Symmetry: C2
Subunit: 556 residues, 2 copies
């Protein structure tokens, strides 16, 4: 594999073997008073600041140098330029990778097969704006002539997580907008419980699916149509209550959607990089097109930062490099995203797809199997909640877990004269300090003595009360979680993932690994129908099917 | 450390070293048509069946025998009996561990300090029953004489995750009950957004906290009381609108609630094992006391299963052992919980606390520092959602990830004549089959051939289409997700966690690891006030504080 054969990697690895055990965060800060200054990036976007403080990491000047050199010798600069220019860097599918084009506010032409994609991008954006005016103003009428009060996005994966996460995060920007609902699971609970809260007269469905043949999405869409038609009793009324985000004109028409309300996107828009496209319709409907444009503008700002900035001070590049250090040298399986923001409660889940489906790969560009780790398992819950759930293990378990802590300085809800946010900030700060510093036996001993512990109880409790510390974190602090700043933040992680994939020599933009489960599911589906025993699989699959057939008739 | 010094563990590890490379799931299944029958448990609870199918794991008869021998040698059965009889097995806090007493439907005596706890457990349950009747019937009136429409649980961690996960999971059982809301984060967004949708006249607050000193919960409760009193203007009206669930009567009184308006629990109820106690009040209010009793009863059934069943046929024991195999022999950092059930959408998040806070430990009963792994990182999203997010990595990344797949046979919403559930089941079944089976180079080659691919296109695409398989899963399938069955499932995992903690020689029931973060946050709190530079910490904490102060008053 290219990474393992790379001399900059081998040097980094040998340095780790010889010196990593020596690295103590406490000592690193003690030896260097400029540590925060030299291991952080204060980004002024002109729409707020983003501070990426990576100083609480197990790195020094040499390590960062070794890491930047690796990025260079793995071709990160060339690959990035190739992405931005419309080159077909999705090499297994032979496709361009152009989520950057979707938010290319500068409108500098980006060509795919000799043709600028910007006119088409902007045409769909114009359609989205017009759509939003019609719906938000109440001008768009339902089949009984009433304004729309609820929007229901129906989609899976990239058609669901992005719009969900962003509408949750930008909820304060939704005054005057319709309520937004997300249906994704094929589990009939999801659509059934959504529809129970809705009126057919005032509900508008967005069916998000490029092919318009996605089984889960289309099944959900058809169930919605059936519920709708029970009330409307007129097939021509479907066009007032269903729109599509798709390129399959024929299938969309067949469903009963006016092809005017089919908003297009392109094969160079990956599902997990799609919220910036027509797929963001539910976002624009919820918060308004102006706020949607701001979100796009924030991403564009970060795209430019990533394109133009030298690697040593390039935010997504440094985030990528620190990850490579933890993944390929320390062997850390996971990466935690810990946003101290209740609005960002689905941020971690979003990057589970964005990161894991991108870089959960094992075949390189040459066709060779990797002989090293690739993408990590991404997880997290918002702070402070996580502190009362799993931080016990982060502080005192047996796992090394790189954590990104994120927070806005300014809250959307400065209640009680800022008291809640003061406490939230203090916890954000205290946790990374605690993870770094720990608590020494001498510090814990004084606490037990003051608590009045006997000699034997003291000695028994002492080791339990010690925190070893030396647990590395990033702290990412930003002025306020506005649409612009959120856009920047998402793009930053998109570009982190990109850099990591190049360094691993893998394709961040395909998803061949979802195919087998889809194939096998299609085979099992019709086998479940009848009463006959299924014997066509391994004994477990057969045994599980037998149990299902037996238990589905049981009356409880 | 006891585990690594144990000869049965040494035997298991050595066997793994010599032989585990030769374990191939596809081949195990082909060679043994009895595999499912011999590596699965079909439990009949008399209120539904639970099938625990562990056949798709990297084990054979010998491995299971060695694992069972290890559990015996690590004293699992004696430790279990000690838990059940009220021995103070939480040795660092010198406390009993008696969540099993909370659901002890048999009412057999369990003594702490020579005194049966059962009378007090049942007294509180009776008070819960009485209160729920008064509220749900509409008899309990607010300060303006209106029935209660909204219940708001305020609490965090163990006082939040259980009630939240259970009311979500048991949502079909809440018809006619009041709406329930969960406020947990200190982040002011959480309470602000919740209060925005409520009327003080018709809202009942439940303040849930073991200590009643938790910063987040007390601050939230004080904000709620301030909001309430702004409307009610009558301190005596607090008794109609606030109920406390605590062990700390004095702090409850201090906050401003009379013990009459307090439902108590006991120090031997760990926060993360507390939903079965007074803490489950919001569950009982939402779904009714009868359904809450059925939840307790299901846990009791599983308690009795765990207590009375030989190790080699004991469900939580076998799950625990498989985990030990993957954690301590294969070195897998994580464990994924993947319920194919939208109602169970918070099940994984609950067990992040249950598992990680219990077993994220590094000191043994002897005072030894472990030289082996302890608790895993728990994560997951419900299927099919998680399936469209991160399964790419599970199938084709570079991590071994033990997964538990869970599904009810019978759906709560059999819409479209069962079509949605049929598809859901097919996916549940196909994914584990796929993870087990994979797709060999020669199989993918033939598919590409049949697809009309050229030898040129075929050979470049081929390796990307290969699934190595041999990825182990558990499938846990149950008749229906009723309150009883859910109670049995939660207890099963509680006991898996217990068995693992015993085998690791750690205390599953303390949490010293959350203390440091709380202490450092209390120090940072006053430093945030005013405009002066903070220089008291490391340069990163100092620098983040400076950024916060600088950016506080930026008018975006």
């Amino acid at each position: 594999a290219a990474l393992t054969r790379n001399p900059q990697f081998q040097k980094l690895l040998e340095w780790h073997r010889a010196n990593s055990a020596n690295l103590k965060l406490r000592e690193l800060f003690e030896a260097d008073p400029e540590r925060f200054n030299n291991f952080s990036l204060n980004l002024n976007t002109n729409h707020g600041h983003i501070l990426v403080d990576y100083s609480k990491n197990l790195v020094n000047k040499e390590v960062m140098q070794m890491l930047v050199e690796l990025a260079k010798s793995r071709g990160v600069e060339a690959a990035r330029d190739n992405m931005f220019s419309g080159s077909k860097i999705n090499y297994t599918e032979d496709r361009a990778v152009l989520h950057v084009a979707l938010r290319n506010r500068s409108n500098t032409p980006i060509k795919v097969d000799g043709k600028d994609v910007m006119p088409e991008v902007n045409r769909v954006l114009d359609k989205m704006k017009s759509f939003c005016q019609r719906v938000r103003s109440g001008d768009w009428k339902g089949y009984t002539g009433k304004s729309i009060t609820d929007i229901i996005n129906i989609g899976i994966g990239g058609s669901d997580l992005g719009p969900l996460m962003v509408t949750e995060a930008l909820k304060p920007y939704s005054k005057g907008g319709p309520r937004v609902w997300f249906v994704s699971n094929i589990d009939g609970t999801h659509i059934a419980k959504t529809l129970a809260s809705l009126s057919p007269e005032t509900s508008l469905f967005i069916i998000a699916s490029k092919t318009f043949t996605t089984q889960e999405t289309i099944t959900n869409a058809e169930t919605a149509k059936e519920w709708f038609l029970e009330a409307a009793k007129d097939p021509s009324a479907v066009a007032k209550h269903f729109v599509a985000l798709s390129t399959n004109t024929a299938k969309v028409k067949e469903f009963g959607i006016d092809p005017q309300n089919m908003l297009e996107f392109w094969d160079w828009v990956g599902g997990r990089y799609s919220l910036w496209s027509a797929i963001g319709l539910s976002i624009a409907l919820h918060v308004g097109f102006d706020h949607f444009e701001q979100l796009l503008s924030g991403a564009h700002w970060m795209d430019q930062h990533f394109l133009k900035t030298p690697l040593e001070k390039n935010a997504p590049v440094l985030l990528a490099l620190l990850g490579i250090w933890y993944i390929n040298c320390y062997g850390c399986e996971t990466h935690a995203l810990l946003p101290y923001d209740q609005y960002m409660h689905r941020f971690a889940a979003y990057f589970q797809q964005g990161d894991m489906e991108s870089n959960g790969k094992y075949i390189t560009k040459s066709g060779a199997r990797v002989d090293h780790q690739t993408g990590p398992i991404v997880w997290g819950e918002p702070g402070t909640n996580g502190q009362h759930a799993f931080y016990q293990l982060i502080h005192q378990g047996t796992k090394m877990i790189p954590c990104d802590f994120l927070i806005p300085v300014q809250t959307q809800h400065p209640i009680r004269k800022g008291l809640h946010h003061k406490i939230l900030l203090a916890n954000f700060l205290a946790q990374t300090e605690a993870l770094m510093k720990g608590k020494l036996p001498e510090e814990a001993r004084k606490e037990l003595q003051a608590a009045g512990k006997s000699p034997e109880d003291l000695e028994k409790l002492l080791p339990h009360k010690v925190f070893e510390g030396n647990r590395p974190t990033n702290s990412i602090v930003f002025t306020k979680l506005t649409p612009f700043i959120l856009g920047a933040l998402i793009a930053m992680y998109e570009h982190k993932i990109f850099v990591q994939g190049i360094m691993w020599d893998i394709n961040s933009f395909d998803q061949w690994g979802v195919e087998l489960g889809k194939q096998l599911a299609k085979k099992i589906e019709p086998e479940l129908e009848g009463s006959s025993a299924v014997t066509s699989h391994d004994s477990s699959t057969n045994g599980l099917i037998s149990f299902i057939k037996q238990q589905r008739d049981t009356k409880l």
